[PDB]
Design a protein around this ligand. Structure first.
Ligand code: BA
Lengths: 451, 148, 55
């Protein structure tokens, strides 16, 4: 840096557009020794950059992906260089306007620290630190990295302002979808021959409600099966997502049955109406912030019972389609409806069959039915072993990791939902004029030492 | 529960109250078998479990009975011609029998609409089978981390 | 303890049963390790390290 022939420009980038600070982040292995000296060099270079160049700061220079050294440390999953840039307080008094941690007032036992929200909550900027902590970083250390000092209180800021509001809208917006469906059911003409001529304007009004009700069940049906291939118990616990799925299944079954021409659709249509008002009993809990261990369990409960239903129904269709292929003489095209009807009744145990006479081939019907019990009894035990093989070893760690992660994940999805006008309204942090003014955040402390 | 059900049935006018009345008498002398333990002072781990066992089975009964009343009251509303006021007693009687599996029904003929009766009964199993697993996951999601 | 013991053991058990399945001709093809001429040459294996001490 200081020489007599030619000096070294600290601001110089590379072919990757990275400066001297970004290489220190890229070698910052989270160990004992390596987290020590990188904090020594990071303080040494920036003070030397200000002393040689008072106009520009070395942190301001971005990359080919427009990344600061603080923005880069969230990507590669670095902690020691991360916790030092956040806790940055410089004694040199010339590189002071870029310091991060401050001391407001020190009335005895109570210290008043002050952290800047410079890049943590970018209101009207491109991309934030906190967004890369949630949306982009795939490193395991993101559970520890959210447990740094300001972000544990920064996430509690916007949770207290947006959590109670966004939950109450979700309760009302579900009640709107129910009162629409009540007006559909009790105002049906009910002749016995569905569908109907949709020419009456006062019947055209309730016709619009089928667009609202059905497509809401369709969006919930096709996104979750895509989310399976590719349980937010904060608001509503994970038992609701399975029950609202069963509500979503019965709607699209209902929509088929009055388009086939069979007038017995009316039983299923009012059946899901009873569940939807009784699904509102999960709204009475309120809001949950303390993580239990059953939260990770109910994802696998939803993961495999949906697999348990599809392995059922494909087997019932497949074995019915199998038995039609045995019929070499003509057989009739209406036999497959009669195979599948006489096959569902055996699993329940109705005994109201039409084709299969168990008195005809008794020694074969039993040994297929006994093995059908053994197939189903093991698939039930695959549920319990997958739960018992989960609640033992590392559930003591991960259930307090994803619960912290999903609590941070949802509140930023709420933050993306508001427009740019309402974004500036409930913004945390205050303007505190320090130096020779910024949007920093007030943090309290209590300490009995340092006298 | 069986006492207040008994008190209704001889005020309705139906003389079959006598079966339920002596039924709870058999339990009450057999409930005295929990008196033989003595007194417990050493804490086990099942004590916090049996609160949630009592918390949700009472919820499991009310989510049952409101669903049985609600679906029976639903099917009366399908009847646009006159229907009769005594049909709701016959819907609810023929609806409890299906969950047990008596098959002694009076109105619902499964031979009439078989492809609809099965797919409602199959989904009725799936509704009840998940609510049973909500008991076991709430117990397994309790006896691991901080129950010690 | 044991679920992270037999899982390590069975992971090593199966890959040697796969190794017994190939003939002697295909055995020499995907052989790990390199010839590095050391001394006054052998089939050794390269291992990387990272250390900030030892200066
Ligand atoms: Ba039976």
């Amino acid at each position: 840096t200081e020489n007599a022939h030619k000096k070294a420009d600290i601001r110089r980038q590379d072919s990757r557009g990275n400066t001297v600070l970004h290489a220190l982040v890229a070698i910052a292995d989270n160990t004992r020794e390596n987290t020590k000296f990188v904090t020594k060099v990071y303080d040494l270079l920036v003070i030397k950059c200000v002393k040689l160049y008072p106009d520009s700061s070395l942190e301001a220079i971005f990359n080919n992906d427009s990344m600061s050294p603080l923005m880069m440390a969230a990507k590669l999953g670095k902690i020691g260089i991360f916790q030092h840039i956040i806790r940055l307080e410089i004694k040199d008094e010339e590189a002071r306007h870029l310091s991060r941690k401050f001391r407001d007032w020190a009335y005895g036992p109570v210290y008043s620290s002050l952290y800047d929200l410079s890049m943590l909550d970018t209101c009207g900027e491109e991309v934030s630190v906190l967004e890369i902590l949630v949306y982009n970083s795939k490193v395991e250390n993101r559970h520890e990295m959210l447990a740094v000092e300001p972000i544990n209180e920064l996430l509690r800021d916007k949770w207290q302002k947006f959590g109670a509001v966004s939950f109450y809208i979700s309760v009302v917006s579900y009640l709107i979808a129910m009162i629409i469906f009540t007006l559909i059911a009790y105002y049906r003409p009910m002749d016995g021959t569905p569908p109907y001529p949709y020419r009456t304007t006062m019947d055209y009004m309730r016709l619009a409600g089928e667009i609202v009700t059905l497509l809401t069940g369709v969006v919930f049906f096709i996104t979750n099966i895509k989310d399976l291939f590719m349980v937010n118990s904060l608001f509503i616990d994970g038992s609701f997502q399975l029950l609202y799925f069963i509500y979503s299944v019965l709607v699209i079954i209902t929509a088929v049955l009055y388009l086939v021409g069979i007038e017995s659709y009316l039983a299923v249509m009012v059946f899901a109406l009873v569940l939807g008002w009784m699904n509102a009993l999960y709204f009475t809990r309120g809001l949950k912030l303390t993580g239990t261990y059953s939260i990770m369990l109910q994802k696998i409960l939803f993961k495999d019972l949906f697999r348990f239903l599809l392995v059922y129904l494909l087997f019932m269709i497949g074995y019915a389609s199998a038995l039609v292929s045995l019929l070499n003489p003509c057989r009739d095209s209406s036999t497959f409806s009669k195979f599948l009807l006489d096959l569902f009744k055996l699993t329940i145990g109705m005994g109201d069959l039409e084709m299969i006479n168990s008195a005809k081939y008794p020694a074969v019907f039993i040994i297929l039915l006994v093995t059908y019990i053994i197939l189903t009894f093991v698939l039930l035990l695959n549920m319990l072993i997958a739960l018992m093989g989960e609640t033992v070893g590392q559930v003591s760690k991960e259930s307090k990791q994803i619960w912290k992660l999903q609590w941070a994940t949802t509140i930023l999805d709420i933050e993306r939902s508001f427009p740019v006008c309402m974004r500036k309204a409930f913004r945390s942090g205050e303007m505190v004029t320090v130096g020779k003014r910024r949007w920093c955040f007030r943090v309290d402390e209590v300490n009995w030492s340092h006298w």
